[PDB]
Every structure is written in structure tokens, then in C-alpha cells.
Amino acid sequence: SLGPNGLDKMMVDKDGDVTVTNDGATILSMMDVDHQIAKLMVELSKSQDDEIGDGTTGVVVLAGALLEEAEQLLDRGIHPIRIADGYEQAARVAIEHLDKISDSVLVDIKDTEPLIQTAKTTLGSKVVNSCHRQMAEIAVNAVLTVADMERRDVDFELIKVEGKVGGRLEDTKLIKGVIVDKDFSHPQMPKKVEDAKIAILTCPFEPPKPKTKHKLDVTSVEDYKALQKYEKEKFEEMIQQIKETGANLAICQWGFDDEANHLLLQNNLPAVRWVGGPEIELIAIATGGRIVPRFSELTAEKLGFAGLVQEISFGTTKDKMLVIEQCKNSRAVTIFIRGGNKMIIEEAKRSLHDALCVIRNLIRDNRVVYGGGAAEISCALAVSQEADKCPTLEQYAMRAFADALEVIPMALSENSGMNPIQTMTEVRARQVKEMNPALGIDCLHKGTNDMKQQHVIETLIGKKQQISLATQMVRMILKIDDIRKPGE
Amino acid sequence: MREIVHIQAGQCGNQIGAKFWEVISDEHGIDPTGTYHGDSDLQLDRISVYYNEATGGKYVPRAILVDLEPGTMDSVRSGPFGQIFRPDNFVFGQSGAGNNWAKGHYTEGAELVDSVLDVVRKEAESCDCLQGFQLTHSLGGGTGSGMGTLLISKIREEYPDRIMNTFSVVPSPKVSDTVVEPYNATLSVHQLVENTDETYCIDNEALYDICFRTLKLTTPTYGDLNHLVSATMSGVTTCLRFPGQLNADLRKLAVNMVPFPRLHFFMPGFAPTFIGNSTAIQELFKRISEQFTAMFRRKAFLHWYTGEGMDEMEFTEAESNMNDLVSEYQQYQDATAEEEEDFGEEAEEEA
Amino acid sequence: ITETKGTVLIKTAEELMNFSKGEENLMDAQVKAIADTGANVVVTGGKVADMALHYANKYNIMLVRLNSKWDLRRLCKTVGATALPRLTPPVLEEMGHCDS
Amino acid sequence: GALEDSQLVAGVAFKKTFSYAGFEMQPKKYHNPKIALLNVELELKAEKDNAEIRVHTVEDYQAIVDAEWNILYDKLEKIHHSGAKVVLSKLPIGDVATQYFADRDMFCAGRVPEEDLKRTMMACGGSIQTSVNALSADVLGRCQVFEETQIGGERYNFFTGCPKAKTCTFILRGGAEQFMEETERSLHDAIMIVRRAIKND
Amino acid sequence: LAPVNIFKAGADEERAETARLTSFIGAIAIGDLVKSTLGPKGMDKILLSSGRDASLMVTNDGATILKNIGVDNPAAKVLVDMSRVQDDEVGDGTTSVTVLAAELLREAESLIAKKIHPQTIIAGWREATKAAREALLSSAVDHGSDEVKFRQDLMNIAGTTLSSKLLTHHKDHFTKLAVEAVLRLKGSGNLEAIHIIKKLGGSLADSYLDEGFLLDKKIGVNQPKRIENAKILIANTGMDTDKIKIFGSRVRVDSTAKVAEIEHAEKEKMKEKVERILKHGINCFINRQLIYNYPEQLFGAAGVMAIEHADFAGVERLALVTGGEIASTFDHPELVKLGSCKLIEEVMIGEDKLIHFSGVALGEACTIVLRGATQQILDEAERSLHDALCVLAQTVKDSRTVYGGGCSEMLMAHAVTQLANRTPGKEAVAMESYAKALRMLPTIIADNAGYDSADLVAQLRAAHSEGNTTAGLDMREGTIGDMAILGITESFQVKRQVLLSAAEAAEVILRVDNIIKAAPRKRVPD
Amino acid sequence: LKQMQVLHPAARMLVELSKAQDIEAGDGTTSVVIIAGSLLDSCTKLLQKGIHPTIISESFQKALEKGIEILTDMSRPVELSDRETLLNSATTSLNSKVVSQYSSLLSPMSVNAVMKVIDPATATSVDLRDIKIVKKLGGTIDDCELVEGLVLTQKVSNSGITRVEKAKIGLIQFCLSAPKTDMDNQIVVSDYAQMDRVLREERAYILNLVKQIKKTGCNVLLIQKSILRDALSDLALHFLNKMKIMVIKDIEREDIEFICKTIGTKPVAHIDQFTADMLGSAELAEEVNLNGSGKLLKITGCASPGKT
């Protein structure tokens, strides 16, 4: 499952549900394993997913190759602590060499081309590659719209990703506003407004009610009539308070009443009902309004502004959705995914998440390396050259590290349908002869082995994390010599 | 602080109490040796209401165990959690009542109730201010019903204005284990009415039909029925034993729950607790009386009671007051009044 | 609090506003009255409330609690103090004394 | 993360707590803030469980309704006027309080663990307050930087820059649960050895 | 298999060869299950439930068949889901899409048997799909500016859609119901505005579309049974103990006469509300909630018909039909609009009575009465009329059409073949296979009628190769004919959706190389 | 066909077929099933000969179209004013059942009913819900009868009155009980005089309603069922008995329309609207006792009879 020519896995859940996926983290997450080493591999993949977001399957392959290569050394009479120490020293050499061959990119809104190329490289391995230029551009635009640049941090609660089945995958789009699964509260309200002034409320459209225990004693007929007048006076008062401030559309977190609904309709002021809390705060951030808990506290300065608010209707079903668009400079953004299967929607969501995480990583650190196995080949050459100067029985461990570091080009070649050993040897000879570390495996058969013009780009922190995390997990595995477990 | 002592009488009462105390002790961290190994001190805010602390750190339950036959104490001592009780609180006779109300109430009980009253005096002497009693017994037996009722009367005489609660099992509708069950039940309800603040009637068949259908797997003996009853009692008494958002002793539940003093019978429930004044009680008594008359009209098995000292009119008074109770319950619905006896004769003339 | 069930019954708004401040002021007065006798450490056999603990921390009073009903008596014998069932500023004769 | 990415903060740091709507509309970095440490539940609720209200007129009904809002706002203004910019509480903070603090450029957190709050007291130098009727300058904390940061999938609150601190905090980076557990077990031995070596040398 | 066990007990794993075998077997089985119901001469299936109390139905719809069977093969669930979402999107095309997906997988298995990597097949299919969609787009005919041509096209579309279902026994009659009803919507796509009422008895040709509206409700006692020149108020308000004065108030007095006085005041509140309602000048009142029997007599004394319990759907449909608004609070009679109709009466159909509105003002919502001799016939008739209405609404929204009877598939196949003849390598062998799939939909149709499918398909291919872009199967005789003359017309959206969905489903399934199953959740027997 | 439990899916359609006929005609439920079975039997040989099912369906449609014309040409027009033809048709429809021997009694009754419910000048259909069938055990089939009035099964709550001549009848939809607001109410007593006052005011409240009812001249009262509050208390029943009024309670909520259509009553849901013009007039209202099977209530001789 590695490279642009990799295949996918199909997992059937414990209740019968079906998932078709390509991510290493999800694959290892849905597997139910018994062996403890398998669980350790699963957790390694999950940790790599947690910090970086891409490269979840390269690390497990590297760890497996490292453990495989340690076997012959164990058979020749070497203490496993010595093997672990040699692996650690080789990892330090490789990491020191890795940032010497790295180039910066530049992160700025004006250009956006290196970022698009990076997202294209990340998305090239997924089923979304039929339209991956579009999705790459969507991802880069969303991250650049949300990101905080002074603190160099982005927040994924301000990016809303959601999809609906039907249509075509190419109908996926980016909305610089909000979209919610609600509709107007009265069937005869207008379906669109074009100069929306949004009043955001947290109080229900009902007469007030104290929280502590209370009783209202009615002891006469005049008391009954006074209470009867008080109810409708309260209703008219709240409607008038909403209308006076200049608002044009109202949004509530709770329900209404029939009287309140008809009074909202009669005064030419649409409303939305039963919207959730996160949606409330997203709308507040997008439209630039403020959240008020009472009608008394509503003022003209606390209304948001929206260029268009519309109710969109999908196909022959009865569902509806509400879209808020043409806002001013907004810190909230939505991705709207379409497609003809549910599995397609899920995999599109996962691929978009991968692209967003990669662009975030580029925001954090802005220097990159070139993929296709060029970086691994160069690191292996550096490790072997350093190991040739080590005579203290540790050269075997370093050479094992260098040999196991070369399983990524071989896996790529085997998946692409070429012959692994000859291709890897040719590329290694070319890299030694010439002086460029940017020669890799021509997976897509474009004729050239140079990855700088093919535009295959990866982040540096991803590579560093892969190497260090795999090495430390291998060191932890090698330390164990005993195991006790109950039988079944 | 406002201590409560617990009294168990009879085989069924002993079996239920032995699990009630077991399921309480694990909540408070007590051990079968009496020591304490709990973690949260929230368990010790109201520990003294049910346990008396002895020198050295042990905790002993405030319980008295009573029966007329030494069979059940030997099991209780030899069973689980049966070594935390005070060895001086076991009271037993030598013969047994043999499912006779009169023997329990007149002949064998009278020579043993003094020992129970001398033990409760010493258990009450050690509490700063007691508030009431807990009693567990049965209505279909001799020691559980007659002797238990005599003990209730004696306690009410000795302790005038302290609360009293009972957890009584009741005869089943379609099956009667004992031939003389209606007699014992009718003669015990008469004096349960006027000497208790509340009664928690528990049926054997109704709770017995939960293990087969809801628990999905059982062919059990009295066993798990007993554990379920103990769980119900613990769910009832959690308010007394533990503090919460609103703590309330059984009086603070009764005052909100019992408007009229003589209608103080309940039907429990359990959903993993519910306590309700459902008037479906009027259906149970209507059955028991239906049996009682059917036997009393034939004077069946009467000589077994008359020979012990009772008179014939005691049964008449008991059935009269049972009818009074049934009518008092019926006067609260006004819908069962629609089911009056269908008219059979043809005299429907001028007036 | 009262032994019989008691409820705080209010009929106007001002009582509702003033109740909590009244309770807090009363608790502060009680703690300060206890502290003014010169006691540095208070030992109790029951629960300690949050506000009482806050006021004890305000006036630099060491607070220790123990729940045995027997360790308390032995401590009372050790320091020569007399147990008190009320929360009142104690008299000099009921002071315990300890070097450390 | 890698084992060389572990860090020690001379201050305090703790995980993000559950938050209501409005938490994302308030600032997340301060330079010389004052910290209010509390043990008071700030939300619209019944005054007491024993309470009960009996009323005869609708005017008094409206007055009773307004009383609760007046009480909550009284507490909030008492907190605001002390000059504090960060507030912490072991007890829940409502959404109304969250939006009130967001509208005035402040930061709030609720249900903070007790150990973390004591640690913050020791690091910054205030005192836990169960009442808001006297929030003096001597009962507030003082740090040099407060921040909320992304650490490997989680959000962490950092109070750093206190030279009068009697407290430090470790952040350990690993790859699997047993890895960090073994790292902590290894560090415990060194901590105990250092303590014993300080006294007898 | 490695000696070490990585999995739990009950977990399962299948690798490349077995995975592909399982997937292809499942897909082909699903395709051949529903092949038999394609074209004007397909047959129906009986479905009976072992669990659901022996429910019985007779159906021809592909989605209905696939949503009811208990498939457990993972590769069949994808096809079932794709068919379901196709039904949800356009409402027609449910069988062609799954048949096409099955044929694509059947070709892919032989291609794999010829030692070709899956990715090569995927690339070839992607190029073929691009060419086919372009060729289909270039063939569309867009009417809509001219009314009579558009209406004739609508009639042709309805006739083509209803040909394969039972309603084809009376294809002309029901066609007149399908068009006119949609033309009542005045451009709104609300298919909930068309209410279908099915009731047993009578023949299938006795069905009709009403010129007014029908309610299956009842009026109160002692109120007029019919009104001429009606004025209608439509409301959504509480009238059974209306005084849910939502506060937590209570009555606390010291005398019984005070309770009687408060009871009388409670009655006066309802009287005042009813008077305020009557202030509008109405003689008909329709409410969605219950109406208690005191307002019932208040309305009866005033000579006003009252309808109670007409749920949200009925209220909205009446608002569309008559033109009023769903009012409340009844304080401003001037700002509320009332509905109008020429006559309201009661009609008797079968064994039931219904309220009939005639001479309505707008008519933007309609009702259809279906008659039949069995429950299954009525259910299938509704199930087919739904497809007809859905495709008609789609066509009205976007009015460009193509030709059916195998013309479109042959056009696509010819374009794909021309593309394949120009490219080098193994990908060409893939693209040709694509064409061989598209020419299977016409063949199957002929195979359902007993015609010599091979000769007909050869003739059709020869005709399309030389430029006769409107040739197709003539099934009433079984020959080759002009589709424009005969009037076999389909919508562009349905065909495009079929093509794209089938291609994407085949591509999704073809990329799987390993299947992993977790331990099933055991049903608790006892 | 309905009482059996046919298991085959095909045989589960035939039953539905019969149902349809029962809706459309009410007769010939057996013949339609016989005909369907015979046609399906004849289809087998055609299938064996090599015919296609489509051709068979089309030919069956052609044959049906011809057969309808033949049958229509057979027919003979009839007019509703000729009772002999209706009697012959009914007795033909009735001579296949167990009650054929009683046809000379059951044939006219049926006809009578259908001519007492419709308007022959403009009748286009008949509503059979206007004819109510009451089944009563006892006697023989020779005791069925036609009642041009109202028949009720529940007994009178009044103890003593069983005959009313020249009856005035009213229908009630409120309750003659103690006051109870729909809102939660309670009466608080803090002095010993209020305890007597409550009882006195209750008595006065009930007595006022009973006197208002008596003022209009009502002899027979019908009370509709209420399951939330008592519709008739013992005090009210005692007062009504003292004024010689016959009381009938527990009238179902679904037969009120039939009662109002039959005897001309107008339902009353408020005491203020209980006026002498909302009452119906009948010539006799009385309960009868069948020998051993029970009691019954007959109201006969309505001045304003409906079509029931």
C-alpha cells in the first residue's frame, strides 16, 4: 500500500459495516490483533498520525525492515544492546545529514505554487487523484484563510468538513461562510435574503422562567385575567425588541412557540430554530456578530452581516440545507464534499485531512526535501560512508541500518512493476557519479529520474520524525527477553 | 447520629438480612473481619448510623437475629460475612412454631420475647439518639408473622414515638406454599395496619418472573431472589447511608409520600429504584379475603388455633377490618365503582 | 442547621439577593470570634465546609480532621482539652496546649 | 514525538478542559496577566436546594426572574473590576459567563483539576478564593507569559516566566503508552536519589 | 501462512487471489439477480419476508429489490449503496447502473487473467469515460423555448419511463396523469405537494386525477355539510384546553365557590378566543390539532364548518391549493389572507367518505386516486408513478434530452472504440473492454424479448459506424428503426448519472487487494 | 379465505381478490375466486404449447372486453318503485345461507331498511353506516325485528323509573360533579368553620345544576363517557331521582353522531346552553327485559326522525 501505484484494503467492521481505505493509521486501527508487537506497531502508526498526519505507512515498513535486518546479526553472536546502540548512532548520522540537503520554499499568500505542488504530491496516492489539482487548491486556500501567522498556529475547529451523498465528486467546493443542516421555521417564509443582518440569540422564544423552585398562586378572577394579559404582552414585547434593533434574520439555539412563529412571519423577519452551539459560535465568528443571552441586551452593534443567506434543496428527497455566504473577511471556512458512494465520501474526507495536515506542517517549518526514494538513498550513502570509519564492532549495526533504510525504493519499484535491485543500483550509481541527491524512482514512467523537475516534494519534519520514531520503537522492541501470558 | 437498629425474624428474614448486610458492607469498605480498607472518606460521613465502633477499630452491625429454630443461625455463622455480627445477638429457641400463628403469638413467643427485649435495650444503650427500627419477616409463616407481630406490639409499647418500617413478603396469587397461609396473612395484616408507619410488600412470584425472562438465564432456588431483594433494600436505604444532592431519611420520604396514615403500603421496582403507592394493593387483599372466607365458612383447621387460646371472634374482627381496609382503598378510585354486581332479578317497578 | 426539616422561603427579590451574603457574613463572624481567643489549631471530628476552610486560611488557623470517635478522646486526654459539641468561641479552661 | 523533545517548564502547564460556545472568540496570549484562582461555580442556577419561592403577582414574578441575572452579573463585575485577565475554577463555568468574558477580552477555564490548581497557586503565588466579595491585589497571581499551544494533537495551557516558583513541570514525548510509562518510572528513581543525596551527601 | 498468530479467534483475512475472486463473484451475482427486469419485456419478482411477519410484495424496481435482500458479501454492499443513492438522486436508472457495474467487473476479471496490472485498467477506463461523456454531451437536444414541442417531449418521456412497469397495460391513460399533475406545480419541485391516495376495489383504469382537493378527515357534529363560495381560515393553534399557560402556576383558595368562579373564567377565555376567530368573516375553519367539544358547539351555533386533526402535510397542501396562510394569535384580521374555493362537499369512494374541494383558486397541489384489485397492484402502481413524476420533475428543471432504445450506449461505445484505435500499449485493450460493456445493455434488452440479439446488435453497430446517429431497437416488431420518429426519449441527467456512477463504483472495487474481517458480534441466544 | 392461513405467496393474493369484491359488490366473493382459478388452470396448456405469457395476457384482455359487452346486452332496466323486483333479488341473494328458511321474514326487512335511508329521487349510493346491526343472544332466528328508533345496551343508573311517555331527551357532554379547574387546584383549610362551609357550598353547587336541568322540562338525560373526572356523583344522582328524571350514563364518544341524527338532539357542552330548544321529543322511552338474556333500552316514536 505504498506509493502512487499502491492498492487499498477493505475492512468489514464488527457489526458488518464496510470501509475501503488506504491510510496506514486507519488500516492498523480497524484490525483486531492479539500479539503485543502488533499492538505496538499500531500505536507507533497512531502516534505518527497524531503529530504529522502523513507518512503513517512508511514508518511501519521501516521498523519491520529494521527488525528483519537485526536477525542475522543476532544469529552471529551480538548483544542486542550493541545493535540498539549502533542503530541510534546511525540514526543520528542520518538526521544530521538530512537537513544538509534541504531547501526552503517560502510561505506567502501571493504565490501559493510550492504549496499546491506539495499538496499534489500528498494527494497523488489516493483515490481522489482523478481531481487532485482542485482538491489540492481547495486545501491550500482553506489553510491560508484560517491560519494564524504571528503565532504560527492553525486551528482545525475553525475548518468544518462535511459531505453529502449524491452528485459528482467534482462538485466538491469551498465555502467562505457556513452551511448548516437546518431550514426556516415557517413553510411560508422567503427562501433567500440578500442583505442579511443576523441577530444571534441563546434564549428560547418563551416567557421567562426562574430556575429555583417557584409557585405562582392564583387566588381570584382578576389574577387570572392579569396573568392572561401578561403572557401575550411578553410575546409582543420580545418581538418588538427584536424588530427595533434593525435586524433582518434571527437565529436561535432553542425552540419557538406557535405564537412566536406566526409573529415572526407576520413582521417579515425569517428565523432558524434548534441550531447547535458549535454552529452558533462558527456563525458568530464568520459574520462578525456577538452572542447575546437576552432580548434586553440586543443592540445595533451586536448584529452580524452576511451578503447572502439561502436555503438549498437537493434532489427528490425532502431534505434542505442553509448556506451563509459573501461575508466579509472570515476566519471560518467549510468544505462541501459530494460523491456517489458513502465510501467515496469517507475516503475523500481522509485525503483532505491529510492535505490540510501537510500544509500545516509547511506552515510550522518551511524547508523541504525530494521524494521518490532520493532522500533515503542519500541517507544510506552517508551512513555507509560514515560506517566505513568505525572499527569497533559497531560497523555491522551501521551497515544493517543502511541496508534496511533502502527498502522504500525497493517497495516503490516492486509496486510500480519494475525490477527492484537493478533500478536501485542504477540510481545509486548515478547519485554517486553525479552530485545531486534529487534522483529517485520513476514510478509514473515519465522518462526522467530527477524529482526536482517532476515536482515531488515532502516536508523535512515528516522524514525526521519517521526515522527517529522508528528507531526508538525498534530499540524498545529489542530490549525484551521474557514474556508471561495466561493460556486459553 | 440518628442510629437505626435492624431486626431479622424467621428463616426468610434471616436469609434476606444476611445479603442486605453483605451488600452494605462492601459499599463502606468493611471486611468480613470487621476492619476498614476504604478509600474515599465520603463513606465515613454517615457510617455511624448503621455500624457501632468498638475499641481497636472494628465495626459491628446494629443487628439482632431472631428465630425459634437453631437451624438458620448455624448457616448464618457458617456462611459468608457471618462473623462480623456480635455473638451475643443470636436468640433462638428449641422447638419451632411449625407454621402456626397461635403458637408463635401465644405459647412459644411469650417465653422468648423477653430475651429480644433485653438485647434491644443493650443495643439502644450504645446509640446517642436512635430514630427507629427496621424489621424483616414473612406473612406466611409462624415465627415470621405471629412472633414478628407480637414483637412489633411489644416494641411499640416500650418505644412510644419512634418510627418503624417493615419489609414483609406476601403470599403469591396462583400458588400457596402453606395450606393455612390465608389465616396467617389475615391475622397479621390486622396488627400491621395500626403499629407501623410504612410497609414494603414484596411478592415472590412477581420478582421470581424476572430471572427467567429478563436475566435470560436461570433455573434458580431462593438464592438470587434474595440477592435482588437485598439490592432493592440497599437502593432504598442509600439516602440514609450516604449524603447526596438531597439527603433524606425515611421519615422525610414518608411525609412527602404518605398523606393518609392508614394507607401506607407500597410496591417497589428496580431498573439497573422506584417506590410507589400504587393502589394495585387493593387487588392483593381482595384475593386473600376471598380465600379466608372460603375456609372460615367450613371451620377448616380451626381447632389447631382454638386449642392454643384464641377465640372464634378474633377471626371475625380480623376479616371485618380487612374488609374496611379494602373499602377504604376502593373509595380513592371512583372508577372500580362501575363494576357493581349485575342485577339479576326482574323487580324494576314504580320505585 | 435545624434537626427538623427546614426550607428557606422567600417572597421578594431583595431577600433572594441578600441570603447568600447573610450566610457568608455570619460564617466570617463565627470564624473570627473563634480566632480572637488565640487558638492556632482547630481539630474537628466531622466535615469541613469550603467557606469555613477559606476563612480559616484567611486567619492563619491550622485545621485537622479525624473521624474515629476514639482518637479524638485520646487526643483530648493528651493535650488536656475538652471536646465541644457547639461551634462557639471556647473558654480558657477548654484550651489544649501543645509544644509543637 | 521523539525522546529528545521532552521539556521542563519552570512554571505550570495543564490540559485543555471542556468548553462551551464562545471559547474560540477570546484571546489566547497575554504578556503581564493577573490570575484569579477561584472555587466558585459561575453559572445561572438555583441559589440553594432548600429554596422555595411563593409569589402572588406577575410584577413580583418579573422581579424574581431579574434577580438571578442580577446576582450572576454582580459576581462577574466583581471579578472583572479586579483587573484579572485569566480566571480558573475547580467548579463549572457556564456559557453565559464564557460569552461575558469573551466580550471583554478575557480567558476562562472550568473544572480544572485540584492538583493543577494547587500547583498554579504555588507557581504564581495567589490563593484560592471561595468568595468574590474581596478580590484584593494580594490574592491574585502574576506570570510573565500565558499561552495556549498545540502539542501533538492536544491543546495545553502554559504559564511561564515566574522566578519565584517552587514548582516545575515535565512534558514527556514518546511513541506508545508503555514507552512514556517506562520513561516516567525511570525518572522517578533519579528524583528519589537526588532527594536523598541532598540531605546526607 | 506464518506460524505466529496475529489475529484474534474468529478474525479472517483474504489476500489478492481470493479477495479478487470473492469480489468478482459477489458483483456478478448481484448483476445477474436483477438482469431479468430490464426493458419493455422484463418480468417482476416476488419478495416475502421470513422475519417481518410474512410481508409480501411484487416489484420490478431495482432499488426495491436490492434494499430488501440480506447480502453479506462486502463487494455487494457497495453496489446496493450505489443503487440506493442513484434512486435518491434522480429516481430512475436503478437497474442499468448495477448491470453496467457488473459487466465492467466481469470484463476486468478476464483482463486480470491476461496479466495486466489493475492501475493500467483504471487509466484506460478513465480515458474511456471521459470520451464517452463528451460524446453523450454533444448529442443532447435542448427544447423548452417552444411550448408544444416541450409538452410532446414530456409525453414521450413519461411513455418511455412507464413502458417497463405494470402501468404499461394502460400506458396512454396514466401518461395523461403523469404530465398534467406535474404541470400543476408551476415550476416548483415539491413532490410532497402531490398526494397519492390508494384504496382497494375497482379496476386499475378507474384511477384519475382530481380537479380540486380531497381530505380523508371528518367534520364535527351539528355543522353544515356543504358550503358554496367558501372562505377558509387555516390555523395551527391549540383548541383542546387551550390554556396551557406555560408558567408553573397553581390555584390556592379557601372556598369552593372561588374554584367555580375560576372554572367559569376558564370557559370565558375559550369563548373570547372563538369570537376573535369568527371576527375574520369565515365560514370554514381548518386546524391541525384537536378541537374540543365546547368550541365545537360554539362553531356549530355560528354555522361554520370545522376540520380538526389535519397534520402538517395537510395544512401545507391546503395552503398551496387555496392560497391562505397558516395563521395564529388572531389579533390582526387585516394582515391575514383567507383561502377561497367554489364548493366544499362530501364524496363517497369505495366504502369511505372524503371532503372534496372544487373550484379552487390556485391549484398548485393535487391529489391522485389509485384503484386496483389487490394491495400489491396498488403498491406497485404507486412505486411506478413515483418514478414517472421524479423523472418529469428532473426534465422540467433541466430540459435537454437524448434518445433511448440503445442509441446512447451505441454512441458512447463508438466514441470509445475510435479513441482506443488511436492509442498504443495495453491501455487500448482496456478501453475496448469498456466498449464491450456499453454494448451489453442493448443486448440484454433484446434477450428479454426472444429476439436474435447478436444480429440486431451487429446491425445497430454497423448503422452507428456509418453516421446513423438515431438508430435503435424497435421492440414492437424487433427491428432497427429511427428513435426520433418513434419517440423514444430519455433525459440527459439520468444517463449521465448512470454512466458516472457505474464507472466510479467499478474503479472503487477494482483497487482492493486484501480483505480483513473482524470477529462478528454474537447474537445473544440465551 | 380470511380465517384460514394460506402460506403460498400466490394463494395469498386470491384472498385479497375476494376482499376487493366484498368492497365493490358484497356478493359473488366465491365466484370470482373460482373464475380466477379456472383461468389460471387453462393457462397451463397454452404455456405448454409454446405461447408466450404476453400474448395470453393480451388475448385475455380482448376476451374480457367482448364479454362485458355481451353481459351488458343481456341486462334489463329496473326502477326503484317496483318492490317485487327488489324482493326477488334479495331472496335470491339470501337462499344460499342457513337463514333461507327464514327468508319470508328477512327478505322484506332488508328492503325496508334500504328504502328508509336513501332518497329514491336522487339516490346515487347508499351509506350502510346508517343501518346498525345489534346481536343479542336468546330466542330463535324468528325473532329478528326492525326498529324505527334508537336501541341501547347499557342500563339506566336511576333506581325505579323504567317508563317515560312523551319523553323530552337531552344529551350532555359536561360533568355533574364537584368543581375542578383544568389547572392544578387545591383548597386550604386553617379554621374549623371552613370545613362545614366546603360541604355546604358543594351541596349548593350540585343542586344549582340539577335545578337548571329540571327547569327546561327534561325527562330523559344522556351523559357521555368521561375517563378523567367523574361524570355523575351519588349526590347528583340522588337529586335527579328526587325530581323524577331517568338517567343513562356511559354513552360512547363515537356513536354521538348516530344518536343525534336519529332522535334530533343537539349536544350540549355548557350548562348555559341547556335550553328547551336543544331537546328532542319521543313518544316512548323505556327499558325492556328479555326473558333471560338481559335488558335493553328502546326509544320509539320520534317527532323529528332522521334517516336511520
Ligand SMILES: Nc1ncnc2c1ncn2[C@@H]1O[C@H](COP(=O)(O)OP(=O)(O)O)[C@@H](O)[C@H]1O
Ligand atoms: N510521483 C511520485 N513519484 C515517485 N514517488 C512518489 C510519487 N508520489 C509519492 N511518492 C512516494 O510515495 C510515498 C508515500 O506513500 P503514501 O502511499 O502516500 O503513504 P505515506 O505518505 O503515508 O507514506 C513517499 O515516500 C513518496 O516518495
Ligand SMILES: Nc1ncnc2c1ncn2[C@@H]1O[C@H](COP(=O)(O)OP(=O)(O)O)[C@@H](O)[C@H]1O
Ligand atoms: N419502448 C421502448 N423501446 C425500446 N427500448 C425501451 C423502450 N422503453 C424503455 N426502453 C429501454 O429500457 C430501459 C429502461 O430500463 P427499466 O427496465 O425501465 O429500468 P431502469 O430504467 O431503472 O433501468 C432504458 O434503457 C430504455 O432505453
Ligand SMILES: [Mg+2]
Ligand atoms: Mg501520504
Ligand SMILES: [Mg+2]
Ligand atoms: Mg426504468
Ligand SMILES: [Mg+2]
Ligand atoms: Mg352469494
